[PDB]
Amino acid sequence: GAMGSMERASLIQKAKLAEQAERYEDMAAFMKGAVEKGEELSCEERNLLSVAYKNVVGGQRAAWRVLSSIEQKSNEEGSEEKGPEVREYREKVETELQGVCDTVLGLLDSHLIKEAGDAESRVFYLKMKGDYYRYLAEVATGDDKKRIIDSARSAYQEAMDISKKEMPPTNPIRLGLALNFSVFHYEIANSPEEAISLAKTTFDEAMADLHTLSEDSYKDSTLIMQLLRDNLTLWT
Amino acid sequence: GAMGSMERASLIQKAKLAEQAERYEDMAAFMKGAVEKGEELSCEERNLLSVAYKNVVGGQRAAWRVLSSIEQKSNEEGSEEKGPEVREYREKVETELQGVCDTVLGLLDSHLIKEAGDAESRVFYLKMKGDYYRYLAEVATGDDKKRIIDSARSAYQEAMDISKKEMPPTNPIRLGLALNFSVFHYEIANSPEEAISLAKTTFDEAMADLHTLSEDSYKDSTLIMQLLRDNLTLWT
Amino acid sequence: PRRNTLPAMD
Amino acid sequence: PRRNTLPAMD
Ligand SMILES: [Mg+2]
Ligand SMILES: [Mg+2]
Ligand SMILES: [Mg+2]
Ligand SMILES: [Mg+2]
């Protein structure tokens, strides 16, 4: 690992500098280096890991969608043949995206998840596992697409089971997990009714628990509740 | 070169796809590959080259400025010592930036400029040479800073001399060259009066030539004239 | 206007 | 609000 000679604390420090500089590829490399030191991650370090890779894969996913759309127009009737270049470049971006997803899933499997015993860390990492299998599913077209989708589902489901048992309904990790699993149902699993049911139950149960919260916790939870409501408004 | 096996036309096609996908590092690699085919670039291909590398170096420059600012706060009195990490990471970003500038300057020197005989191509490439020496000057602190600055100045000056002789005062390349050379005077050469004089003379001479232009040429030239005016408003 | 997942890009 | 040079970033 290219980060093997750098101190864990220095990697975390530079991850935070990279975030401020909007150097998210650097941020992700620094956080990968920190994970590979072998120690568990704190709450703030987990969020650095998530923010870094989400920004990296977000650029790739946006690019893949643009290129996929161009590729599909070219396969319409009446479209002029322009050669293999669009497919080739879409495939190049797709392969790079899949490599980033494989890297994150590898970090979770070696060995973040197996050492995560607290609800907050285990649910966080299982949500991440569901998310990055979901991004693999967005580009999957072959024989293992069903298995990729079921890997995402299985990770989300175990995270949901733990979060329901161990976290209050307003917990921001529980809420973001439910938001993402709901989107999984809507656009990956072809299950829009499940997506809507999950978003609405999650919103309603969080609403009924807001009265227990401080002002700052209330702001954190209601922000995510609004994202759930926005999705419901889009879907109904 | 990693692009040596790809057709020139396919590299240009994929540069345009990369632009649409906002994959500017890819765009720049594709256009570098196209330049290394050895043929001269058309007007549209020159602009693809410029847009690609400007976006790449623009991310690096923005990052360097953030990191430089953090580094300077840390060297204030009363600032807590936090180790070498800020300087190290600023240096890392700076080295990568310098490598991109060196790559562009290498393309211009081997062999874009020496084959550029028309005013539009020669002025374009000399402006690029001034620009990328200018970005080297923005981060230069050592014994060759004066030589870097004079390389930028010399490139801009030859581009100015050609553009004055061979192009109308409303030509968009002439106008953008003057805009950038004016900024060179203001913030690299410590010559704000020269910067203001150049921007105002450039604006006034373009204004007096607008009557010769089509509607579409008028829109192109007046857009850049507004950037000159905005700089003058900032500086006076 | 895309549906929301978390975290969001910068 | 930064002074202008060309081209500008996306
Ligand atoms: Mg190392
Ligand atoms: Mg129904
Ligand atoms: Mg090749
Ligand atoms: Mg004066």
Author numbering:
A (entry chain A), B (entry chain A): -4 to 231
C (entry chain P), D (entry chain P): 387 to 396
Task: Please give the exact wording used by the authors of the publication that reports this structure.
To address this problem, we present a combined co-crystallization and peptide-soaking approach to obtain crystals for any 14-3-3σ–peptide complex that may exhibit difficulties when crystallizing under our optimized ‘sigma’ conditions. The second step involves, after these 14-3-3σ–cJun-pS227 crystals are fully grown, displacement of the c-Jun peptide via addition of the desired peptide for the final structure at high concentration to the crystal drop and incubation for a period of time until full occupancy of the peptide is achieved. We have found useful criteria to be using the peptide at >95% purity and performing the soaking at 277 K with an incubation time of one week. To demonstrate the experimental reliability of the method, we considered this approach for peptides found in the PDB where co-crystal structures were published with isoforms of 14-3-3 other than the sigma isoform, since they were not able to crystallize under the standard ‘sigma’ conditions or any of the other hundreds of screening conditions tested. Not only does this significantly reduce the production time, but new 14-3-3–peptide structures that were previously not accessible with the 14-3-3σ isoform, despite screening hundreds of other different conditions, were now also able to be resolved. The new strategy that we present here has allowed the determination of several new structures of 14-3-3σ which had not previously been possible, illustrating the ease and success of the method. All models were determined to belong to the orthorhombic space group C2221 using Zanuda. In addition, the method retains the robust, stable, high-resolution and well diffracting features of crystals originally grown in the sigma screen.
The 14-3-3σ protein, which has multiple interacting partners with specific peptidic motifs, was used as a case study. We have observed this phenomenon first-hand with human 14-3-3σ, a protein which has several hundred known interacting partners in the cell. Furthermore, different isoforms of the 14-3-3 protein are function-specific. For example, the 14-3-3σ isoform (but not other isoforms) specifically targets p53 and is associated with tumour suppression, making it invaluable to determine crystal structures of the target peptide with the correct isoform.
